[model samples]
Target: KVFGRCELAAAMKRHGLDNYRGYSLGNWVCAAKFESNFNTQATNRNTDGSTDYGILQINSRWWCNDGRTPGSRNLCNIPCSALLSSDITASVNCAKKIVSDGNGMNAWVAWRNRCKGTDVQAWIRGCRL
Candidate 1:
């Protein structure tokens, strides 16, 4: 149901990262692998009515411009469809500025944890290999 690199390449195109490859693709894939496992329709709910959504586990509701709707700050101002689109890089980059300050990969690492699920060991393989 997914095309991996080619699909990722298409998404990268939207971000003008069309030539991204090798370690770049690996990094992106690793990040995505760790986050939502490339699942475009993923969601998590925290207590207090806060909802984390999509691949990369972006809290769209919090990151959204309005920070009021479920998802308004998404790509093209769309809603609840960030991962379904090619805006993951943008979404992730936005998150980097807010929480990681474009420096930390902890957020990305955390998602990789979720994506690994029961196969926590699976999380290590990518790093090891």
Candidate 2:
């Protein structure tokens, strides 16, 4: 499902991800923009033979599993399908757990490549929330 940017921001805020791990909501927004474009059903096959799940593009190598794959640490203890929801509640909770594990938003490559600088202000420009 495709979510509007403001709607995504509001959801992320309600999920307590607004600066929850030293990363601004803008960073979250920016990462989502590049990773999945706020599409909850998004998934990607990474070059390292892992897969990325949901809007955050969380990696299966460490975060989740689909029950058919191996080598998943399942650190979030969530089924990989849980991350692919338009509601995003499970995905946000899992992301919080991921941040708690000390990776922060830096665990997301999208954050590092696009949202980790002063130029990220444009991500939240018109949202006002």
Candidate 3:
């Protein structure tokens, strides 16, 4: 897990996510806060029997495979386990692709439920970056 919001923002910026994929830095940060609380290894099983991966909570249904489940389109072409890494390069890239697919941040339920239409600036308020 990251030490704080500042560290997460710094890492995200280094990965070209400051305004990547047509979304604000605060939008990504706010979504990440609710999605995984900045934990790289985070995973959550949904009622639909699919699992979400990484800080972005990318779904196995469309992006990657958890091995136990089949029929994943594997559109990202990366292993679901890869999303759990601290590197975050693959996860961030995948998230960009997801956004580019026209899903925007709407792909994440956390964004819809909590971040959408919110100020969201407080997500990085004290980061000073």
Candidate 4:
């Protein structure tokens, strides 16, 4: 339902995602609900005023830092906006990295918990990944 839940499970399984409970594929659905609403092209200007793009809501600036706009007519950020250009795994992997680097399983856990009740604090507290 989230574009590729089967693929997500496969990816997470490859990365040992199920090592944690209550934060498996179901949690991914919830997280995606909050993050991008399951839209691969989702984007937002963050509270700090930065912008994020793609389903996982990745900030091109953090990864690119090259002052190039995402989905530029000239060239899209490889493997980032590449979700549309090439592989969906690119988005999943990048999202995994973002989750891993930021909070790993815990961040995902935080995402699910927050999404459960609509209280954003659970998400904030789950940032200890």
> How much does each candidate deviate from the true structure in C-alpha RMSD?
6.9, 1.5, 1.3, 8.4
Candidate 4 regions with alpha-carbon error over 4 angstroms: 1-22, 64-79, 83-87, 105-113, 116-129
Model 1 TM-score, 2 decimals: 0.49
3-95 per-residue lDDT for model 1 (tens digits): 354464346445543223212334444565555666655666656555566655665545633355543344324344554454465554554
* Candidate lDDT (C-alpha), each: 0.47, 0.82, 0.85, 0.50
| Cα-based TM-score, every candidate | 0.49, 0.90, 0.92, 0.53
Looking at model 1, report the run of 10 residues with the lowest lDDT sum: 17-26
**By TM-score, highest first, what's the ranking?**
3, 2, 4, 1
What's the count of clashing pairs in each model shown? 4, 0, 0, 1
Error of 1 at 24 (Å): 3.4
Error of 4 at 128 (Å): 32
Judged by TM-score, which candidate is best?
Answer: 3
Taking the tens digit of each residue's C-alpha lDDT, what string does model 4 give over 2-59?
Answer: 4554454445445444434434544554566567666676667655555666555566
Candidate 4 clashes between residue pairs 3 or more apart in a chain or in different chains: 103-129
Where is model 1 more than 4 Å wrong at Cα? 1-6, 13-23, 65-80, 86-102, 109-129
Whole-model lDDT for model 3 versus the true structure?
A: 0.85
- In terms of lDDT, the best-performing candidate is 3
